[PDB]
Scaffold this active site. Structure first.
Site, PDB file in Angstrom:
ATOM      1  N   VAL A 145      -4.551   0.100   2.341  1.00  0.00           N
ATOM      2  CA  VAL A 145      -3.200   0.408   2.849  1.00  0.00           C
ATOM      3  C   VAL A 145      -3.140   0.579   4.370  1.00  0.00           C
ATOM      4  O   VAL A 145      -2.064   0.869   4.912  1.00  0.00           O
ATOM      5  CB  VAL A 145      -2.537   1.624   2.140  1.00  0.00           C
ATOM      6  CG1 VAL A 145      -2.155   1.268   0.707  1.00  0.00           C
ATOM      7  CG2 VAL A 145      -3.416   2.880   2.184  1.00  0.00           C
TER       8      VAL A 145
ATOM      9  N   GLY B 231      -7.173  -0.117  11.692  1.00  0.00           N
ATOM     10  CA  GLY B 231      -6.937  -0.009  13.125  1.00  0.00           C
ATOM     11  C   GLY B 231      -8.177  -0.263  13.929  1.00  0.00           C
ATOM     12  O   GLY B 231      -9.213  -0.627  13.376  1.00  0.00           O
TER      13      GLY B 231
ATOM     14  N   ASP C 130       0.233  11.312  18.584  1.00  0.00           N
ATOM     15  CA  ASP C 130       0.453  10.024  17.976  1.00  0.00           C
ATOM     16  C   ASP C 130       1.554  10.024  16.949  1.00  0.00           C
ATOM     17  O   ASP C 130       1.399   9.503  15.866  1.00  0.00           O
ATOM     18  CB  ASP C 130      -0.846   9.454  17.395  1.00  0.00           C
ATOM     19  CG  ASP C 130      -0.798   7.919  17.232  1.00  0.00           C
ATOM     20  OD1 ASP C 130       0.166   7.230  17.656  1.00  0.00           O
ATOM     21  OD2 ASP C 130      -1.739   7.392  16.651  1.00  0.00           O
TER      22      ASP C 130
ATOM     23  N   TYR D  46      -9.883   1.851  14.908  1.00  0.00           N
ATOM     24  CA  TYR D  46     -10.756   2.932  14.403  1.00  0.00           C
ATOM     25  C   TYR D  46     -11.547   2.618  13.127  1.00  0.00           C
ATOM     26  O   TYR D  46     -12.643   3.135  12.911  1.00  0.00           O
ATOM     27  CB  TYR D  46      -9.887   4.168  14.103  1.00  0.00           C
ATOM     28  CG  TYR D  46      -8.942   3.989  12.919  1.00  0.00           C
ATOM     29  CD1 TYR D  46      -9.352   4.311  11.605  1.00  0.00           C
ATOM     30  CD2 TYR D  46      -7.642   3.497  13.101  1.00  0.00           C
ATOM     31  CE1 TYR D  46      -8.490   4.147  10.524  1.00  0.00           C
ATOM     32  CE2 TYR D  46      -6.777   3.332  12.022  1.00  0.00           C
ATOM     33  CZ  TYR D  46      -7.202   3.654  10.740  1.00  0.00           C
ATOM     34  OH  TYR D  46      -6.334   3.488   9.684  1.00  0.00           O
ATOM     35  N   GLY D  47     -10.956   1.804  12.265  1.00  0.00           N
ATOM     36  CA  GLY D  47     -11.447   1.638  10.912  1.00  0.00           C
ATOM     37  C   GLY D  47     -10.299   1.440   9.939  1.00  0.00           C
ATOM     38  O   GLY D  47      -9.287   0.817  10.279  1.00  0.00           O
ATOM     39  N   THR D  48     -10.433   2.024   8.751  1.00  0.00           N
ATOM     40  CA  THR D  48      -9.658   1.585   7.607  1.00  0.00           C
ATOM     41  C   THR D  48      -9.220   2.702   6.702  1.00  0.00           C
ATOM     42  O   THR D  48      -9.928   3.672   6.555  1.00  0.00           O
ATOM     43  CB  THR D  48     -10.534   0.657   6.764  1.00  0.00           C
ATOM     44  OG1 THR D  48     -10.824  -0.524   7.521  1.00  0.00           O
ATOM     45  CG2 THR D  48      -9.860   0.276   5.500  1.00  0.00           C
ATOM     46  N   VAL D  49      -8.059   2.534   6.074  1.00  0.00           N
ATOM     47  CA  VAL D  49      -7.600   3.421   5.023  1.00  0.00           C
ATOM     48  C   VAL D  49      -7.572   2.641   3.725  1.00  0.00           C
ATOM     49  O   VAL D  49      -6.963   1.582   3.666  1.00  0.00           O
ATOM     50  CB  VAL D  49      -6.176   3.966   5.277  1.00  0.00           C
ATOM     51  CG1 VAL D  49      -5.724   4.855   4.107  1.00  0.00           C
ATOM     52  CG2 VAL D  49      -6.123   4.741   6.586  1.00  0.00           C
TER      53      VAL D  49
HETATM   54  N1  38R Z   1      -4.758   8.294   9.607  1.00  0.00           N
HETATM   55  C1  38R Z   1      -3.967   7.483   9.646  1.00  0.00           C
HETATM   56  C2  38R Z   1      -2.962   6.426   9.775  1.00  0.00           C
HETATM   57  C3  38R Z   1      -2.368   5.772   8.584  1.00  0.00           C
HETATM   58  C4  38R Z   1      -1.425   6.442   7.786  1.00  0.00           C
HETATM   59  C5  38R Z   1      -0.845   5.782   6.710  1.00  0.00           C
HETATM   60  C6  38R Z   1      -1.236   4.481   6.420  1.00  0.00           C
HETATM   61  N2  38R Z   1      -0.701   3.703   5.354  1.00  0.00           N
HETATM   62  C7  38R Z   1      -0.134   4.182   4.130  1.00  0.00           C
HETATM   63  N3  38R Z   1       0.673   3.314   3.493  1.00  0.00           N
HETATM   64  C8  38R Z   1       1.240   3.629   2.312  1.00  0.00           C
HETATM   65  C9  38R Z   1       0.984   4.872   1.742  1.00  0.00           C
HETATM   66  C10 38R Z   1       0.125   5.768   2.389  1.00  0.00           C
HETATM   67  N4  38R Z   1      -0.129   7.037   1.759  1.00  0.00           N
HETATM   68  C11 38R Z   1      -1.077   8.030   2.227  1.00  0.00           C
HETATM   69  C12 38R Z   1      -2.005   7.916   3.259  1.00  0.00           C
HETATM   70  C13 38R Z   1      -2.717   9.106   3.351  1.00  0.00           C
HETATM   71  C14 38R Z   1      -3.779   9.431   4.359  1.00  0.00           C
HETATM   72  C15 38R Z   1      -3.480  10.204   5.585  1.00  0.00           C
HETATM   73  C16 38R Z   1      -4.046   9.471   6.725  1.00  0.00           C
HETATM   74  C17 38R Z   1      -5.103   8.555   6.200  1.00  0.00           C
HETATM   75  C18 38R Z   1      -4.964   8.596   4.698  1.00  0.00           C
HETATM   76  N5  38R Z   1      -2.207   9.927   2.444  1.00  0.00           N
HETATM   77  N6  38R Z   1      -1.216   9.285   1.736  1.00  0.00           N
HETATM   78  N7  38R Z   1      -0.441   5.389   3.574  1.00  0.00           N
HETATM   79  C19 38R Z   1      -2.176   3.821   7.214  1.00  0.00           C
HETATM   80  C20 38R Z   1      -2.748   4.439   8.304  1.00  0.00           C
HETATM   81 NA    NA Z   2      -3.777   7.398  15.721  1.00  0.00          NA
END
Ligand code: 38R
Ligand code: NA
Ligand code: 38R
Ligand code: NA
Ligand code: ZN
Ligand code: ZN
Ligand code: ZN
Ligand code: ZN
Lengths: 297, 297
Positions: B10, B13, B118, B15-18
């Protein structure tokens, strides 16, 4: 021994730099592109064969300090400068004159089967008398990756999806985007990534055509991802209602998702937008006489 | 032995990856941030000390395959998702509810002398019931360079000019920008470089304050460069005339060039925008009861 007084820096990219300079003997004002090399050499290759009065003039090439220097004529500013300095876009009469000259350039290239590949406001140069010239041919072709931030905003959906073939229609998509920006002052598809860009294309322009939908749904970069599903007006005046009606009509004809549905440059030059009030017939003499009256001085 | 079934990517960057994942035993849906390290460790440091109901929950930390993994709770989507999927911005009642919760978060941090650094739509998470949470604390502080494309669009003029000190006001500038985008659907200061950004700030918001003008005119990055000189309406309703009047009033109060002229988060929470019709008094019970009714299930 540098033959140039560098005067100031007017540009920079992932490629290198553009410097405004003054030849020490000539006193001639130039713009020197300086790289750090395929891209340099294919730009040079292009400027040797191709010439037009709405394309930028190359003067010479040298290789000082293990770097390639491309000396161009210097033109007062760019269209990007205009959008950065003035509110709400270009005055309409002036917009038309710019677009026609931009189109003359693009058509010249497309008649010679060249894809420009980087149409955007910075690469439209504008002289004080308002003659416009196209530049930046490093990526022109009969795909080299273009790492530039602004470049993404003008990329056609087939480039974004990395379709194995694409052609002249990507210059038409980019032009349609730039027209909107020149008309309103606001970039149309500003985006911070390709995924972002794809969403905005689908949201604002149209759904993927079947072939492009196929590539999207098979692409590993984009797996899991479901695009926005959106209805758009079919009428141009409705779909771009803040634009002049015939200008809306052109933009609509440029911004078609399926590249094969986009208008050619040839037909754009002959659009009602330019012929309505005899503009071409009035403009071309005024153009030819400027280039005359300026060429003497 | 990976304890997680990775479900899909999802985010990504510089930085890396989620990754969206599912703990193999728990069956719990998570979002795992995976880097390639100061930034990881200062995000972890922050999440250990700071907690609020409009901030994202951290669950655990592990270091598999010489990389740091940060497991968070999973929240349905982001505000960026909303702007990428729906036309013309957020419906007004829903916008207000989001902003209040965003502000609760920012104020909590500012009361604890944390600058978030940010604020942007991707870093606002939105659950299916519409509870919003702030995330991404890698750059939070009591300057680490943030290489992200979207990040530039929300940067305050002092960050752009690299002023030696800055503080809480940069979160307020970024919020003002995001509000405009959430209200219209369109980013306010989309830009492809800092020079571009500086022109747009001056064109759309205001001239540099004297100190920032001083830094600009002494900066070598920006030498030769003359900024746009532009008059702006002093009245908020006029200056942002496509927004709801009190919403215009907030945006104006956020987007002041001199950081010291910007409204605090505390005062924003108490703005007429939120108190006009008793909204806070009606909203806070509805909020507390959601978190109740959801916490049980
Ligand atoms: N950090 C950061 C940036 C970031 C934030 C959101 C997303 N994308 C995304 N897109 C759809 C849903 C979603 N749900 C979600 C993400 C998290 C985290 C906090 C943060 C890292 C997991 N909790 N719930 N995140 C992609 C990058
Ligand atoms: Na950031
Ligand atoms: N190439 C390229 C991209 C590029 C184009 C324009 C600018 N900035 C700029 N900004 C203000 C004036 C200006 N005048 C100008 C540039 C040239 C060259 C063609 C091209 C390289 C010198 N001729 N006349 N260029 C910066 C980068
Ligand atoms: Na280029
Ligand atoms: Zn400028
Ligand atoms: Zn294909
Ligand atoms: Zn999406
Ligand atoms: Zn300072």
């Amino acid at each position: 021994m540098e033959m140039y007084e560098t005067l100031g820096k007017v540009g920079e990219g992932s490629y290198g730099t553009v410097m405004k300079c003054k030849h020490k003997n000539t006193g001639q004002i130039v713009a020197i592109k300086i790289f750090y090399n395929k891209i340099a050499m294919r730009e040079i290759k292009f400027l040797k064969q191709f010439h037009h009065e709405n394309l930028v003039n190359l003067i010479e090439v040298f290789r000082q300090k293990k770097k390639i220097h491309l000396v161009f004529e210097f033109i007062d500013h760019t269209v990007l400068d205009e959008l950065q300095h003035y509110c709400h876009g270009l005055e309409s009469k002036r917009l038309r004159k710019y677009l026609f000259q931009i189109l003359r350039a693009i058509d010249y290239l497309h008649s010679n089967n060249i894809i420009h590949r980087d149409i955007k406001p910075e690469n439209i140069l504008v002289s004080q008398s308002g003659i416009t010239k196209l530049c930046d041919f490093g990526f022109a072709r009969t795909d080299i990756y273009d790492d530039e931030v602004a470049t993404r905003w003008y990329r056609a959906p087939e480039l974004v999806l990395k379709d194995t073939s694409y052609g002249k229609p990507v210059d038409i998509w980019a032009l349609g985007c730039m027209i909107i920006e020149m008309a309103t002052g606001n970039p149309y598809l500003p985006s911070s990534s390709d995924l972002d860009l794809l969403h905005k294309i689908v949201l604002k322009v149209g759904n993927l055509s079947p072939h492009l939908q196929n590539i999207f749904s098979k692409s590993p970069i984009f797996a899991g991802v479901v695009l926005p599903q959106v209805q758009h007006p079919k009428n141009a005046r409705k779909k771009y209602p803040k634009l002049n009606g015939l200008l809306a009509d052109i933009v609509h004809a440029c911004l078609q998702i399926d590249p094969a549905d986009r208008i050619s440059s040839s037909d754009l030059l002959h659009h009602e937008y330019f012929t309505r009030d005899g503009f071409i017939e009035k403009f071309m003499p005024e153009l030819k006489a400027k280039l005359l009256q300026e060429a003497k001085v």
